[PDB]
Amino acid sequence: HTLVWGVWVNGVDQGDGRNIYIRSPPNNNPVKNLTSPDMTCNVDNRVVPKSVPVNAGDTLTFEWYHNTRDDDIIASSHHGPIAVYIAPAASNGQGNVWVKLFEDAYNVTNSTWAVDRLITAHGQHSVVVPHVAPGDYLFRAEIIALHEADSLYSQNPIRGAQFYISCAQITINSSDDSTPLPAGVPFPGAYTDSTPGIQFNIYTTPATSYVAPPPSVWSGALGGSIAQVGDASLE
Ligand SMILES: [Cl-]
Ligand SMILES: [Cl-]
Ligand SMILES: [Cl-]
Ligand SMILES: [Cl-]
Ligand SMILES: [Cl-]
Ligand SMILES: [Cu+2]
């Protein structure tokens, strides 16, 4: 159970974005139905009044929280991967538009899931803004909590993978457009019951075996991190 508070741009807090530049849902409950329209941008997908200005090459940091800013972020039980996707805003997230910019899943090197790292990072994870066309975009940050994912939601709706989805409105101002954005995948649609990484037993299946759901990270993506970029208590 987690939500996006706001974003940082090059280590500068853009302030509370909830219902402002984040298409915030009403609460922190997961999406679970893989065919749901709610897979696009969560349960209240609508235009919000502000879009955060960035330039290509900026570090854009999403900041998550549980109940209040800079709290426990997400329950530690919620082990799973983190991904970020981009789509042109005019799409409203519809059709074959979502391009993956970032994936972290299980990290053998230090025996962490992405979610574990997110908690350590005070809810903060980042992407480099890609060299796409100037204009308005949706950045879709997605946490998959796997603690109940040994069952399919379609078999038992009390369980299943849990999707914490947040769409931020981002305006890319300066960009040389050296990596034009291609068509992408649909949400809903890209994840199905058989997709790798949707049905997974963290209790009995080795985490080193986990494969995150496709699609693969786009060739144009410039990277990211899961790491604190600024101290929210420093304000
Ligand atoms: Cl839960
Ligand atoms: Cl950190
Ligand atoms: Cl099942
Ligand atoms: Cl990949
Ligand atoms: Cl490319
Ligand atoms: Cu939860």
Author numbering: 1 to 235
What does the paper say about this structure?
Three out of the six high resolution AA9A structures, two from Lentinus similis (two different data sets for the same enzyme) and one from Thermoascus aurantiacus, were determined in this study. His147 in LsAA9A and His164 in TaAA9A were investigated for the protonation states at Nδ1 and Nε2 atoms of the imidazole ring of the histidines. Here, the His residues (of the primary and secondary coordination spheres) undergo unrestrained refinement, while the residues in the rest of the structure undergo restrained refinement. Computational studies on LsAA9A have also shown that the H2O2 co-substrate does not require proton transfer (and thus double protonation). A new experimental study further highlights that H2O2 is the co-substrate strictly required for LsAA9A glycosidic bond cleavage activity. Thus, at least for LsAA9A there is currently no evidence of His147 double protonation or proton transfer being necessary for the mechanism.
In this study, the focus is on AA9 LPMOs, where a conserved His and Gln (His147 and Gln162 in LsAA9A) form the 2nd coordination sphere and a strong H-bonding network has been shown in the crystal structures. Our results reveal that the conserved His residue of the 2nd coordination sphere in AA9 LPMOs is generally singly protonated.
